[PDB]
Amino acid sequence: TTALVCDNGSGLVKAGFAGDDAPRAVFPSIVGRPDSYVGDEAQSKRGILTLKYPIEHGIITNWDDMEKIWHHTFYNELRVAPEEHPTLLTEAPLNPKANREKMTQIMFETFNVPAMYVAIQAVLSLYASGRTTGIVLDSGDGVTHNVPIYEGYALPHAIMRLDLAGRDLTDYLMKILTERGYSFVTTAEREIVRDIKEKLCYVALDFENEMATAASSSSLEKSYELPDGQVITIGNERFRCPETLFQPSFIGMESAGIHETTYNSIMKCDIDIRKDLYANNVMSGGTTMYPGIADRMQKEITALAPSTMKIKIIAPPERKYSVWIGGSILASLSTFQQMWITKQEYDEAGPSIVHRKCF
Amino acid sequence: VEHPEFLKAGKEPGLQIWRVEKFDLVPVPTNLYGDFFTGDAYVILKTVQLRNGNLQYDLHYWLGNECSQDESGAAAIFTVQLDDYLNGRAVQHREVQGFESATFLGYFKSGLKYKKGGVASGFGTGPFKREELLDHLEKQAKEFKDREDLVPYTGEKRGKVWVPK
Numbered sequence: 001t002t003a004l005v006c007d008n009g010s011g012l013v014k015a016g017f018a019g020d021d022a023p024r025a026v027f028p029s030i031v032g033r034p035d036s037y038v039g040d041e042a043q044s045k046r047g048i049l050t051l052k053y054p055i056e057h058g059i060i061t062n063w064d065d066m067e068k069i070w071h072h073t074f075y076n077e078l079r080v081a082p083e084e085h086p087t088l089l090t091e092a093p094l095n096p097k098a099n100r101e102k103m104t105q106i107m108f109e110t111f112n113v114p115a116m117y118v119a120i121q122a123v124l125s126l127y128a129s130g131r132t133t134g135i136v137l138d139s140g141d142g143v144t145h146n147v148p149i150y151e152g153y154a155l156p157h158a159i160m161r162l163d164l165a166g167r168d169l170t171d172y173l174m175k176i177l178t179e180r181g182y183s184f185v186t187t188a189e190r191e192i193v194r195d196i197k198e199k200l201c202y203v204a205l206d207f208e209n210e211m212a213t214a215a216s217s218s219s220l221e222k223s224y225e226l227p228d229g230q231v232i233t234i235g236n237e238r239f240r241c242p243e244t245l246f247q248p249s250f251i252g253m254e255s256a257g258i259h260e261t262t263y264n265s266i267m268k269c270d271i272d273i274r275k276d277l278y279a280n281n282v283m284s285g286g287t288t289m290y291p292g293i294a295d296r297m298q299k300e301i302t303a304l305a306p307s308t309m310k311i312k313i314i315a316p317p318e319r320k321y322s323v324w325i326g327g328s329i330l331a332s333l334s335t336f337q338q339m340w341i342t343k344q345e346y347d348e349a350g351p352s353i354v355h356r357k358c359f
Numbered sequence: 360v361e362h363p364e365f366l367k368a369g370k371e372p373g374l375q376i377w378r379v380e381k382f383d384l385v386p387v388p389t390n391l392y393g394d395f396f397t398g399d400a401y402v403i404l405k406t407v408q409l410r411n412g413n414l415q416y417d418l419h420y421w422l423g424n425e426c427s428q429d430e431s432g433a434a435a436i437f438t439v440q441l442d443d444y445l446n447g448r449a450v451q452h453r454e455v456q457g458f459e460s461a462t463f464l465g466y467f468k469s470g471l472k473y474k475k476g477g478v479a480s481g482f483g484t485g486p487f488k489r490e491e492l493l494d495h496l497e498k499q500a501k502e503f504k505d506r507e508d509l510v511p512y513t514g515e516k517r518g519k520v521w522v523p524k
């Protein structure tokens with residue numbers, strides 16, 4: 001009938017139809033347990049349920065629960081018969097060879113889809129930005145990658161990982177509310193630190209500057225209306241929380257910051273393409289959605305790089321969905337029908353076909 | 360990768376131009392070369408004859424200021440696909456309207472004109488008390504029943520099982 005696009009992230013499934021400009025469904029990638037429940041339901045019931053994330057740090061870990069997720073995506077969320085739809089999936093960079101094969105195997109064997117493809121997330125995002133060359137910062141719920149791409153292809157040796165992501169920003173938001181005396185550690189309230197995060201937080205051009213502006217002024221403060229009507233005050237915490245991306249040490253990380261890891265990714269690539277990357281730095285995934293992050297990263301990269309370098313951060317507003325959109329475009333192209341692994345090729349070659357057809 | 364335009368791309372020396380139309384790569388009438396819609400994205404291939412007998416390729420994808428995201432993203436993917444059909448020998452170039460390379464501008468003897476329009480896209484209070492709050496949170500218990508519309512997951516293997524032969 002039509003091709004499906006599933007972008008499985010650590011904290012959110014983004015599922016829909018090839019050709020739409022957005023996923024028709026977005027829900028938490030989780031399985032709760034006291035039987036089981038999935039996605040929305042479990043999210044709402046979690047106080048009573050044991051929650052599990054079958055994808056950790058962008059890598060699939062629990063395969064039984066990932067099947068359950070894929071099942072729910074097809075029948076309950078997209079409401080489709082998967083045997084009838086070619087299905088494009090997405091993957092983290094450096095996804096083990098073994099996970100790739102298993103993905104393949106499950107799709108054809110458990111779900112019987114007629115065709116399938118698997119695509120590198122950072123690469124779909126670069127395409128959705130309308131570029132074949134650039135360096136993508138992909139920062140989701142559970143993990144943060146830098147992926148340099150040249151003429152359409154990622155350079156693995158230069159991919160940089162960071163195990164710090166949006167989930168951790170939440171945790172760190174949690175605590176600076178408690179230190180300022182608002183304590184939500186309880187999973188019912190968990191959403192609220194998350195929802196506070198999505199809305200009042202922003203990234204400061206000069207960190208310390210914004211801190212003195214903070215305690216000398218009160219002009220940076222904001223308040224939030226909670227669901228019970230109560231009203232609370234929020235300080236520098238707005239911009240202290242995302243600041244951990246550039247200063248991982250706030251949570252204790254000796255790991256370098258996103259400006260640095262970008263830079264270390266660029267400099268691990270070959271000298272004659274460094275210019276094209278410096279000029280194309282593409283932000284994708286919800287944790288990049290913070291106000292002032294693009295102006296920030298710019299100035300940090302405008303600092304850390306040669307005085308002649310032309311520097312641009314591309315931060316398109318829809319970037320929460322970029323991966324999914326690159327997929328939808330890819331999967332829509334007239335030149336794409338031969339790119340699929342068909343059922344027939346799967347059942348000749350088995351799952352090892354994924355290495356030769358998808359890379 | 361059987362697309363009829365891919366067969367034509369890069370055979371003879373000269374200048375080929377396609378426009379992205381609804382996730383497709385479509386040939387631009389040769390009369391119209393040099394006139395780009397600024398609501399559209401284009402793919403351009405310059406084939407030069409090397410003195411060693413080989414063909415030199417330069418693959419330009421040109422993004423109009425108003426082109427929709429599906430067309431610019433398609434442009435770039437087609438550029439990669441075309442390079443890849445040409446054995447990775449093309450040099451790939453991103454040309455944005457008003458920012459074009461002298462090289463790309465060189466292909467148009469009379470010179471490239473812009474113009475408006477194009478093809479439509481292929482897309483379709485006081486002190487905070489937690490016990491007051493926290494009460495709400497545990498105040499929804501017998502409230503939410505499950506979803507009743509669903510196809511529970513059995514583990515059913517519907518597809519043929521590829522034997523390791």
Ligand SMILES: Nc1ncnc2c1ncn2[C@@H]1O[C@H](COP(=O)(O)OP(=O)(O)O)[C@@H](O)[C@H]1O
Pocket residue numbers: 008009010011012013139140141142143165166167194197198199284285286287288289290320
């Ligand atoms: N407006 C926003 N501002 C800041 N962060 C956001 C915003 N929206 C979502 N996030 C965060 O982005 C992360 C999820 O993004 P996503 O790319 O869907 O993750 P994944 O693909 O890792 O599952 C979450 O940590 C969420 O809290």
Ligand SMILES: [Ca+2]
Pocket residue numbers: 008009010121139140141285323
């Ligand atoms: Ca992601």
Ligand SMILES: [Ca+2]
Pocket residue numbers: 398399400425426427430477478479480
């Ligand atoms: Ca158009």
Ligand SMILES: [Ca+2]
Pocket residue numbers: 151442447448449450451
């Ligand atoms: Ca090339």
